[PDB]
Amino acid sequence: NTDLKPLLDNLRNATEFWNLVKEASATDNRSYRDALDWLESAALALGDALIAQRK
Amino acid sequence: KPLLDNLRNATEFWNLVKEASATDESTVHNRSYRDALDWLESAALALGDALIAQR
Amino acid sequence: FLELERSSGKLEWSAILQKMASDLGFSKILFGLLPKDSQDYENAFIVGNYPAAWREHYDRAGYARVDPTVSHCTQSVLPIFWEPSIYQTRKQHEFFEEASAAGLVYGLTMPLHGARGELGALSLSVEAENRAEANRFMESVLPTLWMLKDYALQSGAGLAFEHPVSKPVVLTSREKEVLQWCAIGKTSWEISVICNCSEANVNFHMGNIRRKFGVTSRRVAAIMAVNLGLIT
Numbered sequence A: 001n002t003d004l005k006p007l008l009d010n011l012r013n014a015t016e017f018w019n020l021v022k023e024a025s026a027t028d029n030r031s032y033r034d035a036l037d038w039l040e041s042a043a044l045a046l047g048d049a050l051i052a053q054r055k
Numbered sequence B: 001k002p003l004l005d006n007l008r009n010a011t012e013f014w015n016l017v018k019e020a021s022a023t024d025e026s027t028v029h030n031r032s033y034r035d036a037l038d039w040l041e042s043a044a045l046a047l048g049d050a051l052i053a054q055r
Numbered sequence C: 001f002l003e004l005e006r007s008s009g010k011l012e013w014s015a016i017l018q019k020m021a022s023d024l025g026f027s028k029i030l031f032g033l034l035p036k037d038s039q040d041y042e043n044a045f046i047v048g049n050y051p052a053a054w055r056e057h058y059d060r061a062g063y064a065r066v067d068p069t070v071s072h073c074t075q076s077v078l079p080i081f082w083e084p085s086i087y088q089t090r091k092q093h094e095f096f097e098e099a100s101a102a103g104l105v106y107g108l109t110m111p112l113h114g115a116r117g118e119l120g121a122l123s124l125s126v127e128a129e130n131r132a133e134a135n136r137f138m139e140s141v142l143p144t145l146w147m148l149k150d151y152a153l154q155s156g157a158g159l160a161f162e163h164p165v166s167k168p169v170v171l172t173s174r175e176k177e178v179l180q181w182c183a184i185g186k187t188s189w190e191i192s193v194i195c196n197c198s199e200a201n202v203n204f205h206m207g208n209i210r211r212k213f214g215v216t217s218r219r220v221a222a223i224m225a226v227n228l229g230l231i232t
């Protein structure tokens, strides 16, 4: 089934953005922090929705 | 599938440590600040990369 | 740059504009937007970091009728630069003198015309020692800010005329402490030595702060709190 939680795609964009920023090897950042902040905030947002399971 | 529960447990651990971070003035540093942060990234990274293989 | 983070809230979306304007080099930024067949400039979606005293004087004096940039936006899609040649009439001359007292001397405005008929303007002001230095800087970042005008118009058109009910936020003494230090530009490690905490401690607190505001970045949440008079 397809639930009413279009958050998995949000995390997909946050992880893919982290996946794009991780490719900049040897560049010598504010973009790394925002990528990590988005990854934590998106995963945490899913988790709060992923605990309202109700058996 | 066996990644969503990891994020569910990491978020609840993050949610439990967030109540402990405002129930007694810190004094709960230990490994718990790092591991709660460390666990959230690992769960999102494993789950997120799996959500990109499904075009 | 390309971290085109477009939120679902007016306050965060406004914070990201201020964050991008300061990153590009501009001191002040204003975003105005009007619905399709509306001509009431006072009752318009206006956000940014302009001086609140100037914005209040601007609306009370009805400066939208005298302001040459809003007149330019109704007839063109090309930018207009804050040059002395744009102020022609006597009322526009007084408008320029008083606007400078508010700090809006050098800058430019990008006319906004949305797909569903929206009319608006995106203004950015720069601080410089002379107009020649200001004109040289705005010409360097003119192509990149030309893209920002269309991205802010497409993302802002959906959140401009809604009325979402924001839920009030309250932070702990520690959370409000580390947030004001992050607002001035201190990175996570630097706040750890000031507040005498671990770096994982401040990173843990910013994560909770970002969930309370509903944002996905700490710098955006930091300027949001000062917009509601929460810090500094």
Ligand SMILES: CCCCCCCCCC(=O)CC(=O)N[C@H]1CCOC1=O
Pocket: C030, C032, C033, C034, C041, C044, C046, C064, C067, C069, C070, C073, C082, C099, C104, C105, C107, C109, C119, C120, C121, C123
């Ligand atoms: C199409 C206009 C929609 C409603 C916009 C209301 C006007 C808001 C003021 C503005 O556009 C910024 C601005 O024009 N700044 C100019 C004028 C004052 O200082 C400047 O240099």
